[PDB]
């Protein structure tokens, strides 16, 4: 849900 984590 955020650009800096894997979703």
């Amino acid at each position, epitope marked *: *849900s955020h650009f800096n984590e894997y979703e």
Partner: antibody
Amino acid sequence: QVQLQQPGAELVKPGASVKLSCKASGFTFTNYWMHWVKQRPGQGLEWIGEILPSNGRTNYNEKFKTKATLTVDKSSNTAYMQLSSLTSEDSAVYYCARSPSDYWGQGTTLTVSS
Amino acid sequence: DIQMTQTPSSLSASLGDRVTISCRASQDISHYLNWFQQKPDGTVKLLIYYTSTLHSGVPSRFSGSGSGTDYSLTISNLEEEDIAFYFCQQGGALPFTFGSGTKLAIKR
């Protein structure tokens, strides 16, 4: 069972400091970002920042840089946010949360009063 | 900072009605728009992430759409359990920021 446990309320004096806790359970928080958010009655929600427990990296909203300190205790799977130099402007409900696969704690109501 | 402008700030509708809430970002957020629902007891849940992906257990009456800077959350047929405070969050750039929220109410 994917729970974030926060205390319901804290009462502290102006000028004091407080350490809010956020105990995770039902998952190991190592690779989840742990965020903190401030909510006050007539204001929009504010993002304070986040910490990644695996390596301790933090990303802060610069408005809260001298006010909040995020840390984690990996051995108890707990995230913390220390607030310093409390004023009545710090009175608010503070939430912790994880991301990705977001899940939020129930919030701690902090009152700063004499 | 990417500032989020959410409208409307309050909305009264009839149960069974279709309701739509919007969030406009200041600059492109590359689809990272999340919608959160908060109940009167303080409980907060993620409903939709990355513009249109429903989170676990969220019913199919909830849908999200949008791109670039313009985003919407739509509830097809309002149910009583949907009466709550809704807010968006951009996760496209640091610092993360929220819309100011939409309080739903039942019209009578």
